[PDB]
Amino acid sequence: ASRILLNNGAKMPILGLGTWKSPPGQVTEAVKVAIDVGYRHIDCAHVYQNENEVGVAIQEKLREQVVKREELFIVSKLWCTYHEKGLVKGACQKTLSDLKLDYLDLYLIHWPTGFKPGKEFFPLDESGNVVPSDTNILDTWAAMEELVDEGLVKAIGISNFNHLQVEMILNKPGLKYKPAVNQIECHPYLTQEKLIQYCQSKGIVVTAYSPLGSPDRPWAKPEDPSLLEDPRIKAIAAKHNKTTAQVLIRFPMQRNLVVIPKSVTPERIAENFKVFDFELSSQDMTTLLSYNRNWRVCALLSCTSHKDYPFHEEF
Ligand SMILES: NC(=O)c1ccc[n+]([C@@H]2O[C@H](COP(=O)([O-])OP(=O)(O)OC[C@H]3O[C@@H](n4cnc5c(N)ncnc54)[C@H](OP(=O)(O)O)[C@@H]3O)[C@@H](O)[C@H]2O)c1
Ligand SMILES: O=C(O)CCc1cccc(-c2cccc([N+](=O)[O-])c2)c1
Numbered sequence: 001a002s003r004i005l006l007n008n009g010a011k012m013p014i015l016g017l018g019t020w021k022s023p024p025g026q027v028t029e030a031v032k033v034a035i036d037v038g039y040r041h042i043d044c045a046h047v048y049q050n051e052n053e054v055g056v057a058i059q060e061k062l063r064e065q066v067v068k069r070e071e072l073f074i075v076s077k078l079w080c081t082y083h084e085k086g087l088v089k090g091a092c093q094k095t096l097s098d099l100k101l102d103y104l105d106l107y108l109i110h111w112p113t114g115f116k117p118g119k120e121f122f123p124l125d126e127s128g129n130v131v132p133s134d135t136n137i138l139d140t141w142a143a144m145e146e147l148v149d150e151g152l153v154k155a156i157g158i159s160n161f162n163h164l165q166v167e168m169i170l171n172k173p174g175l176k177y178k179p180a181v182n183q184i185e186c187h188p189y190l191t192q193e194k195l196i197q198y199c200q201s202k203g204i205v206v207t208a209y210s211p212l213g214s215p216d217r218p219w220a221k222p223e224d225p226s227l228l229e230d231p232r233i234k235a236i237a238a239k240h241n242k243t244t245a246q247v248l249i250r251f252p253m254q255r256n257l258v259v260i261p262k263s264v265t266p267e268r269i270a271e272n273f274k275v276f277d278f279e280l281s282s283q284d285m286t287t288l289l290s291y292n293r294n295w296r297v298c299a300l301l302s303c304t305s306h307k308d309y310p311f312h313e314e315f
Contacts (some may be wrong), residue, residue, distance in 0.1 A: 002276065004258060006180045007203045008097040008155045008179040010105065013073050014253055015273060016041030017207070018262030021216050024053045030264040031057030035067055037270045043112060043183075043207075043260040044099065046091065047121055051098035059100045074099060077159060078144070081121060083114030083135045088143035092152050107153040108183055109144065111160045112137055112308045122143040122302065130302045136212060137165070138172045145176045157181035159209075160298075161273060162310040163198045170202060183207040183260075189225055190235065191292040194315040200256065208259045212245055214297040216262075225295055231289065240278050243271060250275045251288050 003011035005234040017034045019027055019042065027050050027274055027287065033041060035057070046055055061067050078100065079101035082091035092107060113134030118124045123131040127301070142184050144156040157179045158169065169179055182199050186192045199206050210217075213227035227233060237247045261272045279286070299311050 002193045004205055004256070006039070006155055006205055007178055008180050010154055012106070012181070012205065012258060013039075014258050015039065015249070015259065015275065016043050016073070016075070016207075016260040017269070018043050018260040019050060020045065020048050020262060021218075022048070022050055022054075022206050022262060022264045024050045024142045026264040028053045028057045029266075030066055032061060034273075035061045038273050039269075040067065040071055040183070041073040041075070041258075041260070043075045043209075044095070045079070046095050046098075047077070047110065051076070051095055053098040055101070055134055069101075073105040074101060075108065077108040077110035078140075079121060080111050080113055080115040081117050081123065082132075083109075083133050083137070083140045084117055085135065085139050085143040087117055089152070092147055096152065103151060103229050104153045106155045106157055106181060107144065107147060108157045108159045108181065108209045109137070109140060109161075111175065112158070112162075112165050112310050113303055113306045114140065114308070116200035124302070128302060129305060130300075132306050132308075133276075138168065141169055141172060141276065142176075148177055155180040157183065157204075159183040160185075160310050163195050163315050164313060165308070165310060166199060166202070167202070173253065174249060178202075181205045181207055181258070183209055185210050186257065187211050187213055187227055187248065188230075188288045188291040189213065189227065189293050189295040191289050192315070193289070193292075196255065196257070197207075198315075203278055206257050208257045211252055211259050211261050212248050212299045214262075219298050225293070228290070233288070236280070236284055240280070242275075242278060245272060246275050246278075246282070248278055249303050250278065251285070254280055254285055 116131040237244045
């Protein structure tokens, strides 16, 4: 099946296109190509600074009648400097305006860490620490719930929440809507077994980000591990007559996850979608899981003292 049922009653495509680092001068064509070759889910965020350009592509394909709005699943995320209850609606509306949509299918709290509001996405003190917000994440959640009730978003969820933070939301006094999704980093070097089983057991769908290990991440070091170059993964790919990237995308799909590989290269966008016609064996799956080393693409030193920094905990 190409879609997974969310706890709001809607279906979410298990494959989507990522847009972090997609240059604004390339992402419009990337999204147009993606829609042309079958993608129906686009993962966006205000902090990526390219939502206007993503929106141009979506709007053209809607106008061209290549796809209907109801067939698309568009996701965006509330940035950390907008956790204050009074800023949440405006942040959502700005994203809607840029994407040229009247609703989002899913809106996520991007990180559990709230930052001081202002123009800067990472407000710093003179010593380089991020300046936190005092807004409780439960209050941010209530503001997210209001977006559902105002028709701006069909579903709400969370991203980069650890199991205790997920539990906090689930245990919120007067909780109105459960998170539909927790979007987290997940790949063979960070397999996330504990957090995934917890979320799934509560009916929360997990989306795997950086499934290829984010080789274009700005802080990549020549000596870091590399999923796409791991000979063990290449061997599994060769056995199945697929590319290493295709194996890396199929892997989370078979764990009942949604997966959102990013590309701006038309050939790779198409390649990455050709993952519905083969199956990894249980042995393949267990072998890939065995490569876990708790290695993360996404974690910032500037946030490690924030009270809600998610990655101190085991999971
Ligand atoms: N919620 C969060 O905090 C969070 C954090 C990180 C990421 N995300 C989301 O997850 C998406 C995916 O993660 P990511 O962007 O970090 O990295 P990724 O999808 O793991 O990897 C993207 C990189 O892989 C390359 N690539 C793509 N397909 C390939 C293929 N078939 N063969 C070889 N190379 C290929 C891309 O190059 P080209 O583009 O040049 O083709 C790019 O350099 C993001 O774009 C974003 O939407 C969310
Ligand atoms: O956010 C994305 O989707 C990609 C940009 C990015 C990359 C790495 C870390 C953080 C980040 C942001 C806020 C807080 C933390 N943290 O607490 O570690 C990391 C953000």
